[PDB]
Amino acid sequence: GTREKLRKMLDDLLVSVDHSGNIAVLRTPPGGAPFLASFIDRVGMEEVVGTIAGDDTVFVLARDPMTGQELGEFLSQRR
Amino acid sequence: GTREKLRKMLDDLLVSVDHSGNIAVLRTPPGGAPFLASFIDRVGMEEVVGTIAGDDTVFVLARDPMTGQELGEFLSQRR
Amino acid sequence: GTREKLRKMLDDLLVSVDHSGNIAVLRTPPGGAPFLASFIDRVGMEEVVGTIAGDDTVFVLARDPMTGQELGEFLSQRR
Amino acid sequence: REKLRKMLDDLLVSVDHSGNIAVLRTPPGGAPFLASFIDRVGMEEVVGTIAGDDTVFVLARDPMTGQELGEFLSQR
Amino acid sequence: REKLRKMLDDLLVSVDHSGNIAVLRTPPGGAPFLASFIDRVGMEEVVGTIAGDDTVFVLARDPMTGQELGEFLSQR
Amino acid sequence: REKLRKMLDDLLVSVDHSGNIAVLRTPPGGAPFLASFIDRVGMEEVVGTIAGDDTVFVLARDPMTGQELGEFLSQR
Numbered sequence: 491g492t493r494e495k496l497r498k499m500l501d502d503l504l505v506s507v508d509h510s511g512n513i514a515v516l517r518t519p520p521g522g523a524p525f526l527a528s529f530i531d532r533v534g535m536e537e538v539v540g541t542i543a544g545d546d547t548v549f550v551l552a553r554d555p556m557t558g559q560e561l562g563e564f565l566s567q568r569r
Numbered sequence: 570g571t572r573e574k575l576r577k578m579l580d581d582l583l584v585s586v587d588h589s590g591n592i593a594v595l596r597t598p599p600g601g602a603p604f605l606a607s608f609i610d611r612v613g614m615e616e617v618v619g620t621i622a623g624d625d626t627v628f629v630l631a632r633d634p635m636t637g638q639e640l641g642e643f644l645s646q647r648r
Numbered sequence: 649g650t651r652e653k654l655r656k657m658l659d660d661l662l663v664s665v666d667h668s669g670n671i672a673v674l675r676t677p678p679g680g681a682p683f684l685a686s687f688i689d690r691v692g693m694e695e696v697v698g699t700i701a702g703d704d705t706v707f708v709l710a711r712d713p714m715t716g717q718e719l720g721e722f723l724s725q726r727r
Numbered sequence: 728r729e730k731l732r733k734m735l736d737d738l739l740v741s742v743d744h745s746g747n748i749a750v751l752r753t754p755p756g757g758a759p760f761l762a763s764f765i766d767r768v769g770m771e772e773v774v775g776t777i778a779g780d781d782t783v784f785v786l787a788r789d790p791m792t793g794q795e796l797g798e799f800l801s802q803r
Numbered sequence: 804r805e806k807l808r809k810m811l812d813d814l815l816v817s818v819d820h821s822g823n824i825a826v827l828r829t830p831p832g833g834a835p836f837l838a839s840f841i842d843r844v845g846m847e848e849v850v851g852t853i854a855g856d857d858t859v860f861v862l863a864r865d866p867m868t869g870q871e872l873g874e875f876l877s878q879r
Numbered sequence: 880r881e882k883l884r885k886m887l888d889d890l891l892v893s894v895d896h897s898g899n900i901a902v903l904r905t906p907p908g909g910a911p912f913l914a915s916f917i918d919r920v921g922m923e924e925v926v927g928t929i930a931g932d933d934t935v936f937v938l939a940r941d942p943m944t945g946q947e948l949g950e951f952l953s954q955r
């Protein structure tokens with residue numbers, strides 16, 4: 491199921507969540523950011539305009555009017 | 570010519586445009602984001618502070634006071 | 649020392665600094681963005697929510713209430 | 728294979744080889760765009776591809792050589 | 804090696820080889836996650852790893868083959 | 880070649896090899912910084928480079944070996 495893989499994906503890859511403005515910042519272990527962010531893309535979050543992954547960090551762009559914090563809180567509750 | 574390659578680059582790589590705040594979000598096919606964003610860099614958009622590409626997503630930072638939307642609308646009109 | 653490597657890292661990799669909103673934009677030579685941004689991560693800037701590197705560009709997310717500009721000015725003074 | 732042909736025309740700056748690897752050079756940032764499409768084709772002789780920024784390493788399946796794999800890509 | 808075993812179970816879609824290279828295929832974006840962990844293990848026979856997006860090239864140390872290195876990874 | 884020499888001093892943590900590949904290890908995120916500069920040099924014996932995060936695969940042109948290509952880079 492998708493909710494279960496989202497839960498396990500976040501359980502295993504989300505080291506921390508942070509935010510500023512319209513951006514939620516996801517911290518992963520090394521190399522984990524593209525792995526996590528690709529999955530987030532594919533679960534189809536309406537509040538998520540898009541994501542970009544580097545190596546251990548993902549920037550999640552919140553759809554207006556939702557904030558980075560509120561977006562990050564959503565994802566944390568999926569854990 | 571540069572306008573023609575910008576037009577064809579956007580025609581072939583820009584799956585969709587979105588925006589939030591000062592960020593225009595470009596969606597590409599798989600692997601296309603660095604290809605597209607590098608070219609955007611090199612055409613020298615004054616309104617563009619910079620770009621970062623992941624795999625299929627580019628975040629374009631709009632130069633103040635222009636918005637992500639207005640930046641995205643500019644690029645769409647180049648199509 | 650860390651301040652010295654931050655100084656030399658910035659001296660050799662920071663082509664330019666820019667900003668918009670809460671994002672400081674770092675420009676590097678080709679391939680230099682992950683090299684620079686990883687180091688910035690590891691020096692532990694409280695004002696820095698996180699960073700993402702592409703190839704020659706880094707987006708540094710400023711911790712509220714600090715701005716991208718103020719964040720970029722901090723880093724420039726480390727040069 | 729009509730789509731791969733346009734993909735190579737627009738992205739393949741050069742093809743080289745050594746041993747069992749064919750190397751593709753692209754314009755900047757083009758490597759994962761080209762290489763992911765090659766994966767999608769799914770050729771039996773391609774063990775795998777790695778994309779950097781403007782270079783793709785394509786591993787040829789033994790006993791095919793990287794020179795042979797590069798010639799097929801250069802053909803298309 | 805208990806952590807690598809879970810890492811491979813969750814990320815290793817397939818393993819292939821040619822010459823002295825073992826190729827790991829992962830779900831999308833999984834390659835640098837898997838490959839950095841492999842580096843961390845630090846096996847003597849692994850000369851190095853490169854991660855793309857969903858493919859990892861693992862270079863086997865002579866005289867070990869990529870087939871042999873892939874079998875050890877497939878084992879775990 | 881004076882710039883490559885400083886580039887290697889600051890970024891080359893180690894050099895290894897297997898078959899026709901020289902492997903460069905860098906500090907974290909250093910691989911595309913080093914590798915793009917190597918491309919820029921444009922050595923005839925370098926068929927191509929791929930950068931991951933901290934590892935660069937440099938493919939040696941036959942009949943040169945990756946050991947030989949790594950020794951030249953280690954020299955500089």
Ligand SMILES: N[C@@H](Cc1ccc(O)cc1)C(=O)O
Pocket residue numbers: 520523543544545546547548682683685686689699700701702907908932
């Ligand atoms: N955190 C930044 C910088 C970074 C780059 C490479 C690394 O290996 C680690 C960190 C990113 O993920 O893009």
Ligand SMILES: N[C@@H](Cc1ccc(O)cc1)C(=O)O
Pocket residue numbers: 524525527528531541542543544599602622623624625626627831832856
């Ligand atoms: N869209 C994000 C996450 C992603 C990563 C890897 C992919 O293959 C696909 C998507 C990015 O481009 O960074």
Ligand SMILES: N[C@@H](Cc1ccc(O)cc1)C(=O)O
Pocket residue numbers: 603604606607610620621622623678681701702703704705706755756780
């Ligand atoms: N500046 C953008 C786009 C880019 C991608 C690849 C390049 O080689 C150059 C530029 C980034 O660093 O992500």
Ligand SMILES: N[C@@H](Cc1ccc(O)cc1)C(=O)O
Pocket residue numbers: 678679703755756758778779780781782910911912914915918928929930931
């Ligand atoms: N050609 C190598 C090195 C490189 C890295 C980054 C670049 O922008 C350019 C070249 C690769 O694509 O991995």
Ligand SMILES: N[C@@H](Cc1ccc(O)cc1)C(=O)O
Pocket residue numbers: 599600624758759760762763766776777778779831832834854855856857858
């Ligand atoms: N399999 C290759 C090509 C690729 C690039 C980007 C992708 O999203 C998917 C595949 C790699 O991982 O480098």
Ligand SMILES: N[C@@H](Cc1ccc(O)cc1)C(=O)O
Pocket residue numbers: 520521545834835836838839842852853854855907908910930931932933934
């Ligand atoms: N050494 C491999 C795997 C790796 C990936 C990401 C890292 O942050 C570290 C290592 C590479 O650079 O591709």
Ligand code: NA
Pocket residue numbers: 519520521545546907
């Ligand atoms: Na890392």
Ligand code: NA
Pocket residue numbers: 543544545622623624701702703
């Ligand atoms: Na990136």
Ligand code: NA
Pocket residue numbers: 598599600624625831
């Ligand atoms: Na993709």
Ligand code: NA
Pocket residue numbers: 677678679703704755
């Ligand atoms: Na570049």
